[PDB]
Amino acid sequence: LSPKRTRFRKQHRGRMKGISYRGNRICFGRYALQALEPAWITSRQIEAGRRAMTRNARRGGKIWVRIFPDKPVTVRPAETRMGSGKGSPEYWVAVVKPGRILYEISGVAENIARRAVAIAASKMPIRTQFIISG
Amino acid sequence: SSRPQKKGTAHHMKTRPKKTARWDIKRGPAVYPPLPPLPAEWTIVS
Amino acid sequence: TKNGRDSKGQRLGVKIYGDQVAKPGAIIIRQRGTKFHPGKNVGIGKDHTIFALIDGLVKFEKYGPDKKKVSVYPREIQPENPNSYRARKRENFRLQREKK
RNA sequence: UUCUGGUGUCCUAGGCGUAGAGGAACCACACCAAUCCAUCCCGAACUUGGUGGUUAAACUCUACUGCGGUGACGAUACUGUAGGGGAGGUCCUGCGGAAAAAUAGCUCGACGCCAGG
RNA sequence: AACCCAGAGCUAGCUGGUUCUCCCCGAAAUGCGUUGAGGCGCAGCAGUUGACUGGACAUCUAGGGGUAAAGCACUGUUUCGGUGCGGGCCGCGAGAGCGGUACCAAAUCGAGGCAAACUCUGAAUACUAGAUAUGACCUCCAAAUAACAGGGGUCAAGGUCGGCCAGUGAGACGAUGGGGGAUAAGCUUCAUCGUCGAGAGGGAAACAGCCCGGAUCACCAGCUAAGGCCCCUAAAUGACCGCUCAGUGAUAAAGGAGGUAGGGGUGCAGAGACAGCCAGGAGGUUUGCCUAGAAGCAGCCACCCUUGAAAGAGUGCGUAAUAGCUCACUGAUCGAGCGCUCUUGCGCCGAAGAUGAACGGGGCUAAGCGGUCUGCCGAAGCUGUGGGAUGUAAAAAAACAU
RNA sequence: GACCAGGCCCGGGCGACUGUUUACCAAAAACACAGGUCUCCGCAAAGUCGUAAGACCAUGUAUGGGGGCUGACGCCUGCC
RNA sequence: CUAUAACGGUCCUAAGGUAGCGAAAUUCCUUGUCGGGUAAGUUCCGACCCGCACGAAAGGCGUAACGAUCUGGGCACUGUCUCGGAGAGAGGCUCGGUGAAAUAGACAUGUCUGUGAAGAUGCGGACUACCUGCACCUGGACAGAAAGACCCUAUGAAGCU
RNA sequence: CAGGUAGACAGUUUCUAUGGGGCGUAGGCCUCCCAAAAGGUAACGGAGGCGUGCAAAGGUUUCCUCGGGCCGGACGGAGAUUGGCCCUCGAGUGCAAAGGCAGAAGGGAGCUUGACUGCAAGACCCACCCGUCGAGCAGGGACGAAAGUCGGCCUUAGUGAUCCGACGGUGCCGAGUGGAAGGGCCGUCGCUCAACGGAUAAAAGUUACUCUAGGGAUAACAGGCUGAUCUUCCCCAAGAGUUCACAUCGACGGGAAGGUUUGGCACCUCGAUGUCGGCUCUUCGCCACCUGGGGCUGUAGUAUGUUCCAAGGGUUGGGCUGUUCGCCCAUUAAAGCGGUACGUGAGCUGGGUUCAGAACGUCGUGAGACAGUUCGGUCCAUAUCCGGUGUGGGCGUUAGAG
């Protein structure tokens, strides 16, 4: 959602790169949501997907939110554009590159996790798929 | 919306003729066998 | 309303790299703190800069886990010279000042 | 001519730990007293002068990869040039260079001087 | 704050303008400073005259780094599990010894992630230097002809320090590396490079910056680069493999799809595999709670066994509830392929603007899109044949570079 | 009977009013005004123009002469 | 009972606005709310006072008469209008005389669409147009004027404080 | 002659980067990042400090290791002072950060004044000015027994050129000569000259009464790029709808198109592209208000709700306001939204880029001012060409005609 302490208030951007070879594996959970598409995912889509698959499981099992934002995005107001004064308490952002696991789920059967992970992939600006723990 | 139209010199890096066929880049000019050198263009006759 | 634009412009760095001819009094390293400790045939400065004492090359070698040791060696090397373009340059200077 | 022990220098830095050994000689602790000296108090430290026993502590030697340090090859990311795709974020080719991490290993240092017996 | 005359041809860091020719060379839009920002002084980069010089371009080697990548060893930050310093209440009638606890939290371990102001690491390039290496041409030459090498001659090119003497100091786009923005702008600011500026020609329909390419001049000469070969408009209605049926062929996505051409997996069949018709789909049973009824069909809890060829406390409809229609499953007739997933290639929809085909045009199912094979067209490039000028150079001729 | 020759009423704002004002885009709510108040001035006055002589004031003498503000008239004009 | 403040304390000043007025030539929110007028009224009038930011000679509140003053409403009246129509003159049109002007690089001076210094008769593709007058209309020629009064720059000028 | 003293009067100043402004902010020095692994490098990019302080916190000799957790000790507890182990550089360095520094550059003790004079080979930085380091020599010393070390501080910030003036001192000049007045030279002092390369020792505002030289380098109106904002549509479905995601809405989110609002850039135009509303008169788009056809409906019929095709045609009269928009009345099949530079002022008229006069509130000491209000306030024009509507004349239509 949002980090409590910030070492630095405002932080500039950074560009996407190739396939994340570290966060591609499955640590916990049986099923996952691997992203094929490098972009930003705010904490707002993470709340949307989290409510989506928690209320789409709704009887048993547990999900695993992998990513945390850890960088802010400063939106300048409509004040005729010259400075980056204050935009730090505005929306946070997680960098996602291809390969990276976004969500995981366990305790759920086959097609209930297919609709749980697949319906909650519609709350997201980047194309994904669901991955079994091989 | 949020899709930028490609203006001038960005239109030229996109819509220029590019021969993107790996065969037609390999083509060199044709080679005929060499011929003996032609004689003199003219000659003094006295 | 910005609280910025406080640049500094100050410069430092390695002045003479390794395997290079030094001079007596030539400033080898300008550094902040001691990235390069003074070895032999060198001297440390008032603001920890490393200058050479004698002529010769400079070298770098460890004496701990990280340290670097700028040193100076006397360099009695290389008498032979197979250079032949330069003699053609001076010889053509002679031929052009004798031709005209 | 090995050990012993003052001394260094290159060092992949060679250490922790578990084990075995050494008091002929050497090194080191221990007991007694304080005159130079000394601790913001103590001869704990330092100094002087002796009983002089031990390896107990400390040093030295030999093993182990249990930690530690070091660390591959192949790959692969990246990147220089020459290009291509995408609406963008950005990706893919030819040639050259080439990681890091991890892993297989390597490492319980190596060369010199001088005085004994 | 009148008008005329005079200072006065005031002053203007501002605007406009500044007139004949030929040849050689040729920028810059950067930094610093400025009562300065559209000015100026200096440096950078020109021209010319020198004096020292011997370098440039390729290849190799050596040095410092801390960028990209990477990583959690420091600084933070963060997801989860366990032991969890410590608290939360029931609590006892008290100076109190320690009892009650599936609940929250410092610390560590494990599995993990992220960071321009984090680094145990660490490239490629770049910078400094060292080192290796004749750049073309003509001619002689070993009894000599080839060739190797050599002798001689000619040309071309780098830099430093000056003298005199200018402009320039508004840049623009394209690739990469980033910051500001909303990783929006033909946006703004930087760093390396290419072009324009100051660059003509060809391709791009037209069109500064995109690709080829560097225009001394002539020819009613030839060969090519980029790009093209149906017609407008030069050259192939060329050849052989596949694909597209949307005129896609100019276009934008999420997502949907028995589109079509494949490719990889997995499951059933000559002891009959798929699709349709027909037969069965029952007993305890209306499992136990509720309701008037809940009989599978408003719902709650599990969600049986038996006959068997198979039947599910039911897949849906329906009824006041039943009854009942029907299906998952099995039996029977003909019979030989049928599923269900990933995946590309080209396609479809998504895809809608205001004057009128508007996407070069006509049009084409190839004249479209991918993979090769041979030729041609195609510039002011190159070559050839001839002039001119500049530099060597100091007379002419000749040569090489321009 | 042609030409000629008042349209009016009901409310409100401002200015009391008749007048004056930007010749050539503003006639007004602007200026002035009668009235009020403060303040200066004893004549060799104050004030104004002029280096000066001097002049207006004024051949007038505080019931008069300047200057500031407000604007008839009616009620008043508070505190510091 | 909901309120609201007769009343109270405190801080700071030199003093904390008196009478009267009050969404006003003053009120941003605001077309405040109510009542009148109107079929319907951001304008008008009468009120409340939450006076952004009235107020007592930079006077405040009133009023008869007055005003080419502003503004609200009503009667009569009519081409203002619905929704135009006819007629008379001076022009305009034609002929004869006289006869300019602003403007003007040369003009063999189409439409769409696209491109381009981002609004093209002039460049590209297509379509459409025999040449050339006369009478009307003015959409374009970024039409004419006139070195933008607005904006900014000038180490400009000037007035005023 | 001297003091005081009125913008009554005179000459002047009143910065710049910027958002091209009231309302702000900054101007000079240092550290990290941006900064793309040499150095450099910009933005009103992200974070901080500095305008000093120390008689030791300088010099030298010598000694020592901190910091944190645990355990012990009726004051004293979690934590003071003391003892012991563990981790070994995480502490500290006058203060911001960076790089350093573990038998230290960190802490203590002794003696101390090199926090000297005269210098200085060579380097770095380099527009210039500057600024930084320095072996080595002489004098005279400090510490140490000596070796050696010391020309301030672990380093980088803690500052300011010049002209002039002042103090201390001197074997210098002394306008005929001897002096003196005065001036040098040396050592230092005096600027928040902080707009910090400093204009002068000394300087604020307004102009709507304005004026000139310029600029599209630079705003407004309009066009262009962008699409944050707005309009429209679509993907998923937790729900609401007696049951029931998808008759109808659809939360949390996501993907597009358009260029009609407000914005961003400043690319054409200021030697002139005339904004807002109304009248007249077009034409065009569909994101459909009605008319025509249809699907679905929680559609019994009437009337619907939503949606598909379809832009041929229509889309009223009025009270308020300058009004666009909007409210209200009477209705109507319905009283659509927009493009065409307000679509349209070389066709026409009011509020306004609120022009010159005046008044109210408020601000200002004042001149004056308000994206506050009110009253009054000149708007030109004979069509050259294209374009249009009408109407001819010539020629052509292959002999000439009706």
Coordinates of C-alpha atoms (C1' of nucleotides) in Angstrom, one line a residue, chain D:
Chain D
rU1 C1' 71.5 -28.6 8.5
rU2 C1' 66.9 -29.1 10.2
rC3 C1' 64.8 -27.2 14.5
rU4 C1' 64.7 -23.0 17.5
rG5 C1' 63.5 -16.9 17.5
rG6 C1' 64.6 -12.1 16.8
rU7 C1' 63.6 -9.5 11.9
rG8 C1' 61.2 -8.1 7.4
rU9 C1' 59.2 -8.3 2.3
rC10 C1' 55.6 -10.1 -1.3
rC11 C1' 50.9 -11.7 -0.5
rU12 C1' 45.7 -15.6 -3.5
rA13 C1' 46.4 -12.3 2.6
rG14 C1' 46.3 -17.4 5.3
rG15 C1' 42.2 -16.3 10.3
rC16 C1' 38.1 -18.7 14.0
rG17 C1' 37.4 -23.6 15.7
rU18 C1' 38.5 -29.2 16.7
rA19 C1' 42.5 -32.3 17.6
rG20 C1' 48.3 -34.0 18.9
rA21 C1' 53.3 -32.3 20.4
rG22 C1' 57.7 -28.8 22.8
rG23 C1' 60.7 -27.4 27.5
rA24 C1' 68.1 -30.1 26.1
rA25 C1' 68.4 -25.0 24.3
rC26 C1' 65.2 -20.8 23.2
rC27 C1' 60.7 -17.9 23.9
rA28 C1' 56.7 -17.1 27.4
rC29 C1' 53.8 -17.1 32.4
rA30 C1' 54.5 -17.6 38.0
rC31 C1' 56.5 -16.6 42.9
rC32 C1' 60.0 -12.1 46.3
rA33 C1' 61.2 -7.1 47.1
rA34 C1' 61.5 -2.3 45.8
rU35 C1' 66.7 2.0 45.2
rC36 C1' 66.0 5.3 38.9
rC37 C1' 60.9 4.9 37.0
rA38 C1' 55.4 4.5 37.8
rU39 C1' 50.1 4.2 37.5
rC40 C1' 44.1 11.4 37.9
rC41 C1' 44.4 4.3 43.1
rC42 C1' 46.7 -0.7 42.5
rG43 C1' 54.9 -3.0 40.7
rA44 C1' 47.4 -4.8 36.9
rA45 C1' 50.9 -2.0 32.8
rC46 C1' 56.3 -0.1 32.9
rU47 C1' 61.3 -0.4 35.4
rU48 C1' 65.3 -2.6 38.4
rG49 C1' 67.3 -6.7 41.2
rG50 C1' 66.7 -12.4 42.2
rU51 C1' 64.6 -17.3 43.5
rG52 C1' 64.4 -20.0 39.4
rG53 C1' 59.2 -24.4 38.6
rU54 C1' 55.9 -25.4 34.9
rU55 C1' 53.3 -25.6 30.4
rA56 C1' 48.6 -24.0 32.9
rA57 C1' 47.9 -19.2 30.0
rA58 C1' 50.7 -17.2 25.7
rC59 C1' 54.1 -18.5 21.1
rU60 C1' 55.8 -22.4 17.4
rC61 C1' 54.9 -27.0 14.3
rU62 C1' 51.3 -31.0 11.9
rA63 C1' 46.5 -32.4 10.2
rC64 C1' 41.0 -31.4 9.1
rU65 C1' 36.9 -27.7 4.8
rG66 C1' 32.8 -27.5 10.3
rC67 C1' 32.6 -21.7 9.8
rG68 C1' 35.6 -17.8 7.3
rG69 C1' 38.3 -15.9 3.0
rU70 C1' 39.0 -16.7 -2.1
rG71 C1' 36.8 -18.5 -6.5
rA72 C1' 36.0 -21.1 -11.8
rC73 C1' 34.5 -23.1 -16.9
rG74 C1' 30.2 -23.1 -19.8
rA75 C1' 26.0 -20.0 -19.9
rU76 C1' 23.4 -15.5 -19.5
rA77 C1' 22.2 -10.2 -18.6
rC78 C1' 24.6 -5.9 -20.4
rU79 C1' 27.3 -3.2 -24.0
rG80 C1' 30.5 -0.9 -28.7
rU81 C1' 29.5 -0.7 -33.8
rA82 C1' 25.7 -2.0 -38.3
rG83 C1' 20.5 -2.5 -38.5
rG84 C1' 15.3 -3.8 -37.8
rG85 C1' 10.1 -3.8 -35.0
rG86 C1' 6.5 -1.2 -31.8
rA87 C1' 1.5 3.7 -30.9
rG88 C1' 4.4 4.0 -26.5
rG89 C1' 6.7 1.6 -22.5
rU90 C1' 10.5 -1.2 -25.2
rC91 C1' 12.3 -5.5 -27.8
rC92 C1' 15.0 -8.5 -31.6
rU93 C1' 19.3 -9.5 -35.1
rG94 C1' 25.3 -9.8 -37.6
rC95 C1' 30.3 -9.2 -35.5
rG96 C1' 33.5 -7.8 -31.1
rG97 C1' 34.1 -7.5 -25.7
rA98 C1' 31.9 -9.9 -21.6
rA99 C1' 29.6 -10.0 -16.4
rA100 C1' 27.7 -10.5 -11.4
rA101 C1' 25.5 -14.0 -8.1
rA102 C1' 25.4 -19.2 -7.3
rU103 C1' 28.1 -23.7 -7.9
rA104 C1' 32.7 -27.4 -8.8
rG105 C1' 37.0 -26.2 -6.7
rC106 C1' 41.4 -23.5 -4.1
rU107 C1' 43.2 -21.9 0.9
rC108 C1' 44.9 -23.6 7.9
rG109 C1' 50.6 -18.7 3.5
rA110 C1' 55.3 -18.2 0.6
rC111 C1' 60.4 -16.4 0.0
rG112 C1' 65.4 -14.0 2.5
rC113 C1' 69.2 -12.1 6.3
rC114 C1' 71.9 -12.7 10.9
rA115 C1' 73.2 -15.6 16.6
rG116 C1' 73.1 -21.1 19.0
rG117 C1' 73.3 -27.2 19.2

